[PDB]
Amino acid sequence: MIKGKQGRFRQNLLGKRVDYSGRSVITVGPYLRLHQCGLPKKMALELFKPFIYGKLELRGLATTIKAAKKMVEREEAVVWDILDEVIREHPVLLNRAPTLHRLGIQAFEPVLIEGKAIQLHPLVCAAYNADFDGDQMAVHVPLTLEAQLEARALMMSTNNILSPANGEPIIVPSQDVVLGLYYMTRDCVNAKGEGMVLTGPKEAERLYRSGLASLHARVKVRITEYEKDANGELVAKTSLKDTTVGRAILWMIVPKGLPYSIVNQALGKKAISKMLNTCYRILGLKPTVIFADQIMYTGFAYAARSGASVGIDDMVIPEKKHEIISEAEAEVAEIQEQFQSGLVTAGERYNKVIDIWAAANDRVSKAMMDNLQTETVINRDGQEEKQVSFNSIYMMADSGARGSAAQIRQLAGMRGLMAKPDGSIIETPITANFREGLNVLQYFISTHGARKGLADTALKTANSGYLTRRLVDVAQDLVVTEDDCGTHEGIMMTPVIEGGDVKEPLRDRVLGRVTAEDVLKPGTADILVPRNTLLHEQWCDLLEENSVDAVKVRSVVSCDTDFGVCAHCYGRDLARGHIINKGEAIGVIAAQSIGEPGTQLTMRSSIQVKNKG
């Protein structure tokens, strides 16, 4: 009864079943803002029954609590209005069942809806790692004023835009809105309403909605760009910038401070993430939240307008694919004949077959990619012009909305070698793509890897849960007790090198970390950075300008505080743009940040200088 999962500790002390908890499936509800979530009427009624009883007694409608319960059972009209009052400003916690990381549970300001399903705002669903497939989230209701205020200040979604694991925002557009933004931020060499000048974003939107001018067409527009260079002030810059109608429409959405360079590009998923990060760093949290909600609305609307449908004809089989397969067949036949004559051993024969099949796979992949993006041709008022593809599959892959290049290869190009359960590569790869008919033996070889991957996912989540538990338990004995440790010693930080291009630049590693010692400019005996200053975005960019190589950095290990970790030694919390607040639990944050990717983690001479220097 004491030890084990069934033991009283883990069952009833560490994690306790709680009251005021509601569970239901998830729904998108795009109309909701970021802090608001849909909540069924009956679910809010059941969850908020004590508050409803108290408000009923205060109103005088029911003299006794028993009368209030009878009123609730009758479900009369006055009960609904009372439920509206309590729900209006009382945050509730939305919590996905596997709470891998800190963002697993986030508060929301409930909005009463007619239905039986909870609606979660689309942007945060990526942060919740929640799909819309019978996924269910527990809904807990804070009771005390301390609790409601606590949820509003911390647990609420708008309060934590940045994931604790890394400074990159976690509410980044994921599937539909990113696709719509990519569709808006694209250029077609010939389209309706091309080559005309536009007064501003308002005129661009008016032209598109009227339909006389196409959504994506290169047009010179006037934009009022605002700069944050002025200290706590915005300065307007007016210029004629060549762009598409879609980009000009998108510009009115973004806040003033952000420059036009970010929206001028195609705005892939990484581009939108960088846009949100820059908005957070420059404009602040509230403009970032408003911009995120507005960008989600615009992405949804213009994706619906786009109608980026997936179709069989959308995928294209390479014309060179059959010839490549024939050439590979000739090569494998020659290697087989060499094996028969005994010129090549069985092992080297198998290795050569695998290598040439992989080379043919890469060739057919390149041919498929060229048939996707390069093959698209439409005139530029002249004879012929070549442009980037508007094919739906290539839009989905390139924008980063869904899938990757490898999956596009699997759909249209040759699938490639599929491994046997032992891990050894099968000699004969799956020639047919997923679009064409697939052979029975080919399907068997594929399902080998599929079942292997499913079992790997099961063991991955099991071991990831165990690792997260161990990480938390070695963690949680660390809080920020002391504001400043005042220790000179710290770890040296240099860009990581494995012999190739640097995996991580020095700036990203040193970002958010307080220097252990005052670093020096390349000019000798110059104090480029003071000893104890925190490294913000502008400061780090300045460090990139001077191109420093090694920066001594305060580390939690170097911190000598007893039973605690210095705030300056820890550095930026990464939850929000400042030095970590005193007292916050670094240990559990870090343990969850490490444990969370565990599911994504898989279960299983001479020296040449890259560049002159």
Binding site: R17, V25, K42, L47
Partner: protein, 1316 residues
């Protein structure tokens, strides 16, 4: 030729490849196994009689009295399937066994018995399988899934790697009996053979050989080849054969007859071996050092005194050589040892072995098996002979013996069940050879090694357990009791064996609870093969290699259909064509292949058998003369795909669909979609819920008809004939004269089951599929069961689907559904929930069933009757009282909150001896009248059929037609006929008719007695009231919607019909799906399915237009003929000219809603064929139509993909999931939620949630969840009072769970205290 239902609607069939074998009866596995199990077998193998013959000696110890089995019969079940289901009693056939007891006169076993005693004893109540293949155990259907367990035999596991941490391989051999004690032999890292039995401590493997009474010298002879040394004056010249020289370097120069062949320190050449053989000299000079390394093979004793010069298996030394020379023995025997291959493993393990005699070995074995007990010589001998040499305690099955011999490569197939000494020594030799290098370790994952244990074998094993326990009891009783005192009935007790069988059937890991929501689910669950179960791998102990699909699973179990979750791959379903061998190994039908012709005859091949042969690809083109048009065809010979020549091929796949199961095959375009998505889709299909009306799948595999026919839900006509009468309750067929029996055939009557609850709370309703006067052929679908349309399994309703993002309402997997879907009730699914209120005998008086309840509204009481039970057919909502029950001094059953439905029927069961209430009496009398009327109508229908058969015969014999009319209808015997065979037939029919009148009155009386007698109830209850709620579940936001291809998503919003996008034709799309899902999860088939459904609906629309306007039958005829032709050649080649032009109109009437299309699983329609199908209709060949926004009205750029797709509503509805609760009843740990349950309670805030709050700067809310919300009684009460007061204040207190922990630690004797 086409059956009439096939004529009513014929699926257009793609796929050029013909099938040589029709799909077998899907439920043939379970039905055939149980049929073998119960069938009387004079041969007495693999049956109940086999178990009886195996265990009935019943020989009294020295009492000279024994009971011998003679025969066993299964009496007819007391209750029918419907009656036992409604009553809750198991559907069981009473087992009465005739047993004969004979008493030998004392002191003379050879003397004949003094007397013979004959009697029939009813022992055990055994469940009987229904025709559908499901046992009814407690009024709920149960089918025991077949168990995939490692077959008995000897197996060799490499165990490479992790053992010894040095990369060495540790070979082990396991002899696994079917029932008994495992025998395992293991190689140590030191290479000593150790034996471990039943996971005991490792013991030297030689010890058993001592227990085998084999002498040490005989052991060394068995496991080594003796090398002879002759005492010679020329320094002990030794007889050497060149064969032993191979594989070893020459430690010494080898010279014979003055010629040295291999020099000192020179590797021995095979040429040197051949030269020495050519010389052929037995004796070769050897030095003293070589014999020193050798080991003496057998004991040598001095002749003078008898003392042993050299101990057996003792290392030689120079002084030992001097002593043996002193002995002067001419023959000296030495073991052969080859370091490269022939290791002397027996020698070292013998040195390790501490026992030199049989008795000491037996003592050590007894100590290992029974530590803590003093060893006894006789006891140890009995223990060993019982462990391995006794049939009763150790048994190897016939399949086990065959696998054992095949692994040991012995010639004989069948042998003795008992393990024998020769078997053990052969196993050790095989293991030693494996260690040497000869042979290879077999794979446990190889499906040839893993047999399928069907329900029959498991029932036989449990019955044998009951029989052996009963046998021990009867042996104890018979010796004690005096002979001839009592008839041999009381000695046999039915209770132990009956309890064992009932325990196995009701409560077992393999006795899964039936999932009856879909006919596909019903067939899949019966066909399901599970590695879990008794005598099988558990989920945790299951290794990774077991879960992964081995290449031999091809055509035997479906690699696609495996349940995802804790048990992945362990529960893989049986493939469609697979059939179990008599030994239990899986067999796949394979076409015999002549060198140039694919011969039509099919030979079933086991997993081990297919390894020897080469099997052709299913997707291999045939010239129709049997020749492959391709000179080189891909094949699977050794489990790996490889090109092969035409002549090399020895076997060909029976069909393209043999690899996938019944569930997986139903997914169209299975070759096009990803394996993971196919797995998920096949899982989702079993979870679909039947709709109010079944709708045919416009795009289908073509196996839907087979699934519907083979499933038990569909009522199929036993004998073909015309339907004189069709009704919703019942269907009556007038049997054809040819197909009807010559006598007593009558006319067939079928009673369709109306709306009844399932094990998954889904309605089962057979709706008649034929009309009055419609001929029905043999083996034809009569009425459509759940999720069935025209004999085609129709799980869900297909509808127009458009792939496009719609303002994010279909974000990543979400699904948008039009208001039109709700309006026409396409996904409205009838859900039947049964609520039971039981009157329990209690202290202070029994609880009453009266209508009057203290402190209730009169309006609620109005719905109930006078007796206190809700009126049948009444409408009730959440919170209402269904039946009024008062606690002794309130306990009235109430509708669960949220549930709203109408009561289909109320059944009340009352114990014998307690008076039935007024409503119960009314229900009983109504049941009596209903059963009597149904029975009498059946009798008069049979009378009508009997007269009709007789009426046709009265024409012969001179009987006038008018004279017949005056004579009474009931009896026609009075009219005389000329004597003939027909006259005798009429006389026999008349006598049988009188006997049937008597049988009819007797059966009516018996049914009355069955209804009249009060139903048996659990002790402590007076009567049980069962009320069934029928709830119609409208499709609702949050419901789970899943296609067949695996795209699963919830319905985000019920968009209005006007808001929905519409094409230029003006039809709004019913469902809007997210295209972005398609590239990420490569279920590209759903897009191809969408295009094919679009083509089908286009053809259907053209046919409907041709039907809306009055059109010539010839025009529709030629149009449908063109549609069925469709360019590329197809197997069907259906001809419209055969149709009578009246069947054409009905076929078009069926086709107008949609055109069924049959797509083979792996030979399905190609893209070119789909394009041609679109071109045949008016619809674009591109498959994408310009679509106009419902709200804005502007047509979308980049025209979207719109087409009809099959979509299944999953039973995972939102209303069942929704569980919000403020406060609920607590547990004994006082944790208020009391577990997440359908009964009100709260969700768990587990460890990871607490970590999440801790990572946040959140502490107060965590403190609430820990104390004031969950387990602080004072805290909870004060919090509730404060909240209702409006002031939200918190008092921490201490969690009651913490005090529980403190008290539990105190109970351990550890002082834990709270410092002040």
């Amino acid at each position: 030729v086409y059956s009439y239902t096939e004529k009513k609607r014929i699926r257009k069939d793609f796929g050029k490849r013909p099938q040589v074998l029709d799909v077998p009866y899907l439920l043939s596995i379970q039905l055939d196994s149980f049929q073998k199990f119960i069938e009387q077998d004079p041969e007495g193998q693999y049956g109940l009689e086999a178990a009886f013959r195996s265990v009935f000696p019943i020989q009294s110890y020295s009492g000279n009295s024994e009971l011998q089995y003679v025969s066993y019969r299964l009496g007819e079940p007391v209750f029918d399937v419907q009656e036992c289901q409604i009553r809750g009693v198991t559907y069981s056939a009473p087992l009465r066994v005739k047993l004969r007891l004979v008493i030998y006169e004392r002191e003379a076993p050879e003397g004949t018995v003094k007397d013979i005693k004959e009697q029939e004893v009813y022992m055990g109540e055994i469940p009987l399988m229904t025709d559908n293949g499901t046992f009814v155990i407690n009024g709920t259907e149960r089918v025991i899934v077949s168990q995939l367990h490692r077959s008995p035999g000897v197996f060799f596991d490499s165990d490479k790697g992790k053992t010894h941490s040095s990369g060495k391989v540790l070979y082990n051999a396991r002899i696994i009996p079917y029932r008994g004690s495992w025998l395992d032999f293991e190689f140590d890292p030191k290479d000593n053979l150790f034996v471990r039995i039943d996971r005991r401590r490792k013991l030297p493997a030689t010890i058993i050989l001592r227990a085998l009474n084999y002498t040490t010298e005989q052991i060394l002879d068995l496991f080594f080849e003796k090398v002879i040394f002759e005492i010679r004056d020329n320094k002990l010249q030794m007889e050497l054969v060149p064969e032993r020289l191979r594989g070893e370097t020459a430690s010494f120069d080898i010279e014979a007859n003055g010629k040295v062949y291999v020099e000192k320190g020179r590797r021995i050449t095979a040429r040197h071996i051949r030269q020495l053989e050519k010389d052929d000299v037995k004796l070769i000079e050897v030095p003293v050092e070589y014999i020193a390394g050798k080991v003496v093979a057998k004991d040598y004793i001095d002749e003078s005194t008898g003392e042993l010069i050299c101990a057996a298996n003792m290392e030689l030394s120079l002084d030992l050589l001097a002593k043996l020379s002193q002995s002067g023995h001419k023959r000296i025997e030495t073991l052969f040892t080859n370091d490269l291959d022939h290791g002397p493993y027996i020698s070292e393990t013998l040195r390790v072995d501490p026992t030199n005699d049989r008795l000491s070995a037996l003592v050590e074995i007894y100590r290992m098996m029974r530590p803590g007990e003093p060893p006894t010589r006789e006891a140890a001998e009995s223990l060993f002979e019982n462990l391995f040499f006794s049939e009763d305690r150790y048994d190897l099955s016939a399949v086990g013996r065959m696998k054992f011999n095949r692994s040991l490569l012995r010639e004989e197939i069948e042998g003795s069940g008992i393990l024998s000494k020769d078997d053990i020594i052969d196993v050790m030799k095989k293991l030693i050879d494996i260690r040497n290098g000869k042979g290879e370790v077999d794979d446990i994952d190889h499906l040839g090694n893993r047999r399928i244990r069907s329900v029959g074998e498991m029932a036989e094993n449990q019955f044998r357990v009951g029989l052996v326990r009963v046998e021990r009891a009867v042996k104890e009783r018979l010796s004690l009791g005096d002979l001839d005192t009592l008839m041999p009935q009381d000695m046999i007790n039915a209770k132990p064996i009956s309890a064992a069988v009932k325990e196995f059937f009701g409560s077992s890991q393999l006795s899964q609870f039936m999932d009856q929501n879909n006919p596909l689910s019903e067939i899949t669950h019966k066909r399901r093969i599970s590695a879990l179960g008794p005598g099988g791998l558990t989920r945790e102990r299951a290794g990774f290699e077991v879960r992964d699909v081995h290449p031999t699973h091809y055509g035997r179990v479906c690699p696609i259909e495996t349940p995802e979750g804790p048990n992945i791959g362990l529960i893989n379903s049986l493939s469609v064509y697979a059939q179990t061998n008599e030994y239990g190994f899986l067999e796949t039908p394979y076409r015999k292949v002549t060198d140039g012709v694919v011969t039509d005859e099919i030979h079933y091949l086991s997993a081990i058998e297919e390894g020897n042969y080469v099997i052709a690809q299913a997707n291999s083109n045939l010239d129709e003369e049997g020749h492959f048009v391709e000179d080189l065809v891909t094949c699977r010979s050794k489990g790996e795909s490889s090109l092969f020549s035409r002549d090399q091929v020895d076997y060909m796949d029976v069909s393209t669909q043999q690899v996938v199961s019944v569930g997986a095959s139903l997914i169209p375009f299975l070759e096009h979609d990803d394996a993971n998505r196919a797995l998920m889709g096949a899982n989702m299909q079993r979870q679909a819920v039947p709709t109010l009306r079944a709708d045919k799948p416009l795009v289908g595999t073509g196996m839907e008809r087979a699934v519907a026919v083979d499933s038990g839900v569909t009522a199929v006509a036993k004998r073909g004939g015309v339907v004189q009468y069709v009704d919703a309750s019942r269907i009556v067929i007038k049997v054809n004269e040819d197909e009807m029996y010559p006598g007593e055939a009558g006319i067939d009557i079928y009673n369709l089951t109306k709306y009844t609850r399932s094990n998954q709370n889904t309605c089962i309703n057979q709706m008649p599929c034929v009309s009055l006067g419609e001929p029905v052929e043999r083996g034809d679908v009569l009425a459509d069961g759940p999720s069935t349309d025209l004999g085609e399994l129709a799980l869900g309703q297909n509808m127009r689907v458009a792939f496009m993002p719609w303002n994010g309402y279909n974000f990543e997997d979400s699904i948008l559904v039009s208001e039109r879907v709700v309006q026409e009730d396409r996904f409205t699914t009838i859900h039947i929930q049964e609520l039971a209120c039981v009157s329990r005998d209690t202290k202070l008086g029994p609880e009453e069933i009266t209508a009057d309840i203290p402190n209730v509204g009169e309006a609620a009481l109005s719905k109930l009757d006078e007796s206190g039970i809700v009126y049948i057919g009444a409408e009730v909502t959440g919170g209402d009282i269904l039946v009024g029950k008062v606690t002794p001094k309130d306990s009235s059953l109430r509708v669960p909150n949220g549930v709203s439905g109408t009561v289909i029927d109320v059944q009340v069961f009352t114990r014998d001896g307690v008076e039935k209430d007024k409503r119960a009496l009314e229900i009983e009398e109504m049941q009596l009248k209903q059963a009597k009327k149904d029975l009498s109508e059946e009798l008069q229908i049979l009378e009508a059929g009997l007269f009709s058969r007789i009426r046709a015969v009265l024409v012969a014999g001179g009987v006038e037609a008018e004279k017949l009319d005056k004579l009474p209808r009931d009896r026609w015997l009075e009219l005389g006929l000329t004597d003939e065979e027909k006259q005798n037939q009429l006389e026999q029919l008349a006598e049988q008719y009188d006997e049937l009148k008597h049988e009819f009155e007797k059966k009516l009386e018996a049914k009355r007695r069955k209804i009249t007698q009060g139903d048996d109830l659990a002790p402590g209850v007076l009567k049980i009231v069962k009320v069934y709620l029928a709830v119609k579940r409208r499709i609702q936001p949050g419901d789970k919607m899943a296609g067949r291809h695996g795209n699963k998503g919830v319905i985000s919003k019920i968009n209005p019909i006007e808001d929905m996008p519409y094409d230029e034709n003006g039809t709004p799309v019913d469902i809007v799906l997210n295209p972005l899902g398609v590239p990420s999860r490569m279920n590209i088939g759903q897009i191809l399915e969408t295009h094919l459904g679009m083509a089908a609906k286009g053809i259907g629309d053209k046919i409907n237009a041709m039907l809306k306007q009055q059109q010539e039958v010839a025009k529709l005829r030629e149009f449908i003929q063109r549609a069925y032709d469709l360019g590329a050649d197809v197997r069907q080649k259906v001809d419209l000219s055969t149709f009578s032009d009246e069947e054409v109109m009905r076929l078009a009437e069926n086709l107008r809603k949609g055109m069924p299309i049959a797509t083979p699983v792996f030979d399905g329609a190609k893209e070119a064929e789909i394009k041609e199908l679109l071109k045949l209709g008016d619809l674009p060949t591109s498959g994408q139509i310009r679509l106009y926004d419902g709200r804005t009205g502007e047509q979308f750029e980049r025209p979207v993909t719109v087409g009809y797709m099959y979509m299944l509503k999953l039973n995972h509805l939102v209303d069942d999931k929704m569980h919000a609760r403020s406060t609920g009843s607590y547990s004994l740990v006082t944790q208020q939620p009391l577990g997440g349950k359908a009964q009100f309670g709260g969700q768990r805030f587990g460890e990871m949630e607490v970590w999440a709050l801790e990572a946040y700067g959140a502490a107060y809310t965590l403190q609430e969840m820990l104390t004031v919300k969950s387990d602080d009684v004072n805290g909870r009460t004060k919090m509730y009072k404060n909240i209702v007061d409006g002031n939200h204040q918190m008092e921490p207190g201490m969690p009651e769970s913490f005090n529980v922990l403190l008290k539990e630690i105190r109970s351990l004797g550890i002082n834990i205290e709270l410092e002040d």
